[PDB]
Symmetry: D2
């Protein structure tokens, strides 16, 4: 009850990057340093194994290990929300119940993608997991190729476990929910400022907070600041020029907080974009980005692409 309201009050949730060692196994030391940096800079929640976290590339044993690890090490200092959704109701059920048993505070649930279903199918799917604990519903039609229509959100909102919506359709859809008292986090970093201050969004579930968490906290807490929004836009444009998480993986390797190791099918942004990133870090100021090391361009041969992880 207050578990769900504890999620509803979060303004800055980081969709945290999963860092890798050279053979593609998780780098738990790098991961811990990233989550600590997020806490120190006023991140209030983490999504573990979301799209930015490459949950789709995880075996389920890695994923529950990472949720349990994150609860064990950080559960007292940050809200841990497992991405335990799936296009398979069986996996969503299994993952969500194992997630809560290891003490995660919440679950992020997308509608079934690729294997898309009917409105009745979609409701049936969400009813199997909504009862298990506090739940953020994830609408990202650019990835799923299926819009969760307002009628479905309204019906799901009748359950008190439905904490709110991670919305990516845009600020009109955000406002359609917030004006009826439904909590919304923007999923679009380049819209979250206008979403928070003009459209009643509680805050952001952010990719950009992986690089500049202090600046993203400032954006959601310290009142409208279109000057700061405009200073971040070039970084946000760079981050989303290829599909997330290609930008943030490339960037965190340039900042030296993650090794230059990619699980396929992701590959780094090319040299031309890594040179652009150095200029963006200098223009914003290195002190605002995670890590202490000097940003590097890196050579192509620094990047390790792994298929057998």
């Amino acid at each position: 009850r207050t578990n769900t309201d504890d999620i509803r009050s979060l303004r800055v949730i980081t969709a945290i990057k999963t860092p890798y060692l050279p053979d593609g196994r998780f780098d738990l030391q790098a991961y811990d340093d990233l989550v600590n940096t997020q806490i120190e800079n006023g991140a209030e929640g983490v999504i573990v194994g979301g799209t930015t976290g490459e949950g789709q590339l995880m075996s389920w044993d890695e994923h529950i290990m990472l949720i349990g690890h994150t609860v064990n090490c950080f559960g007292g200092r940050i809200k841990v929300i497992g991405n335990t959704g799936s296009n398979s109701t069986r996996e969503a059920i299994h993952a969500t119940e194992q997630g809560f048993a290891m003490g995660m505070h919440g679950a992020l649930h997308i509608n079934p993608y690729y294997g898309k279903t009917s409105i009745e199918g979609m409701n049936a799917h969400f009813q199997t997991v909504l009862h298990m604990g506090p739940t953020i519903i994830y609408n990202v039609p650019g990835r799923t190729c299926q819009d969760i229509p307002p009628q479905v959100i309204f019906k799901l909102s009748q359950n008190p476990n439905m904490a709110g919506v991670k919305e990516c359709v845009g600020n009109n859809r955000v406002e359609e929910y917030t004006e009826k008292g439904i909590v919304v986090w923007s999923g679009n970093d380049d819209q979250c400022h206008d979403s928070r201050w003009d459209h009643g969004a509680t805050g952001v579930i952010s990719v950009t907070s992986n690089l500049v968490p202090g600046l993203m906290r400032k954006l959601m807490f310290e009142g409208r600041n279109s000057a700061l929004n405009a200073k971040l836009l070039p970084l946000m444009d760079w981050l989303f020029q290829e599909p997330n998480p290609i930008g943030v993986n490339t960037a965190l390797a340039q900042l030296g907080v993650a090794r230059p190791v990619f699980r396929l099918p992701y590959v780094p942004l090319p040299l031309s974009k890594r040179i652009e990133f150095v200029k963006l870090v200098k223009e914003i100021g290195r002190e605002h980005f995670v890590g202490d090391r000097d940003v590097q361009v890196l050579d192509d041969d620094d990047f390790i692409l792994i298929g057998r992880y």
Copy 2:
């Protein structure tokens, strides 16, 4: 060597994306599955996709999926080409599923571009290059489900590999003709376009959902020349089958025809009663003798259907 194996996939005109039927507790009905595959072979299907979108590969555990492929090869592999849907948005899953499927004697692989976790053009090529060397491969472009079009530049690059059999293309006849005019083999992924794709745009044939119901008629459409009459007669059935996302239609129809149990793995649920009545009417317009099974088509009561969450 590989050239003959690839040419054996390229010659196929009718490939059925076969439905996976279930027991009351949500496990595979292998008995019902074997009868479906036998019915496809008897009515001219030359190939089968095992665990495609239509076969709910998305809902299988990998041990279930690999077993169904090995089972299809062992029982039917001398009588039909067995093409495993061993694709994934995860390169690691695609590598292991594909090498295991080929090691168990499947004739080909269907490989979609990474969906949901979509990647760059460079990433897409790197993904396909890990599996294209393993054997005859059909690249699957269905941007309506993946939300990412495989652009012609990826297809032209992959077609330099002799294991690249061809494309299952869902974008339309214009995209079909961009490949067939250069001699890249194309199967239509769209039942309501495949007649025109086949006779007017150089498509070799169809990777079909409708062939689950009327395999005889789909074979006739793909072999016996232009037949606008027969294509129009089927259009109402194809419109019924795709009014909700596949395979809700085919799953419902095969239970109504009595060739699979009315058992659904969530998040799929059957078409409602008024649609099942519509289906009985469509079966009578075309003729029950053209549909799979012998039992009279039934409407079925809402409570005849079982929905499984924990399969």
Copy 3:
């Protein structure tokens, strides 16, 4: 630092895994069993050992159970994951995942069924000794391979080797304790003498699942051959058939676990369930876990599960 905390423990319960009727874990019932162990002075739990039917678990349910136990109880009791395997690959992955989820220690058996050379055994243990505090498990009755003293003395030089769960007997326990190695008896009917006469730090116990208070008294309040004699009937009953057949049957009779068995374990037959009702009365039911009157149960009360 971390290893010294494990070396002090005297009562470690090899905790039973209870099931719902479809064969899935009964986490409510599991949590109730662990809360009772803590209330009655149990200082550690083995999660998914032989008693816990680790061998019957899927990977994800074993790793989940360890993580669940750390999250719910890690502050009140030491959680030792049974992450050992006859496969080095499985021992590596389970041990590193167990420690990442915050378990305090790992229990490591020598490879069973696919048994290996002494050199192979040393190679196996070295892949996991570096990951955290490790108890080496010698149970030649189940592995059909005795870990020789030579191997234990060499491993004991590694500061991550906390000590040995030893089942060979009290002469073997003393050979290790007199040479400075920490030993827990793995034999409930030997652990008293082991503790008071042979230098054993305490017990990794099955019987503590039924009578955790009496087992704590047996390990802490001094030599007491009369209490030991009073428990010997219950211990002989618990080991008539291979563990965990006895403990699974008893906890069903006490009403703290459903009468649900994962094959290939089946319950003790009716004559033995009647003996257990008598042993409970002889000892006093207030000493046994749970509040319900001890039932005999019918043969048809027991659900045997193959597909779970």
Copy 4:
């Protein structure tokens, strides 16, 4: 009634090889080396193969690897040899899934051991076997030295009432073998050094063999062409060498020395040391290289030629 023919087709096999699983340098299966090992067995009179038994390191496989190897062997060789999947487990759930998957992919038979480590009661053991016995031709594996639990005759006699019980792989010895054969139960010896006397003096149908990995033609001779004490005595030094450390350490070392498998070990197995590899070269000379699998001169191999993999 097809069940009867299928089970009888297993019962008539006299030479069954517990085939070694060979690896690439990173620990994955070497399917090329495996196909060459299986082709050699067929060319030299082996009539069946156990896929991923103890000798084949089934205990170290993930089930996706194991099921793949069964389907691969059925698909490439199923017409030329009988394929028996080791789909047994100390877990009844794993035994049921592995066995129904194995049969669904066309394996001819299943090898079922009694639960090891997590051992059960007589009643439990019967319950375990009854869940898989109905799926098809089944060989019950009694190996008390590895399981630490003898499958007692009362259990075997009860199981032999099922038409799908093809027979027993028995390791207790010739007196236990005779107990079963004198009652008409088909038995294969699982002890290479006993299988000659078991075959000709105690009514064993043949052998489920480790040694046939090295000298398949000699083992076929031992099982088909009558009593031959001299040939049996000449294989004994090789058979003692193969079992001085737990199987399959010996056969893994030997197949590397003969150059038919790469010198790659999945832990917890490690090669016999140099002194034993030098003995092996001597044993091969004594018998004749022509009788051992492969065409390459036998090598001693250096310690540093061996790769040990934990994270496979």
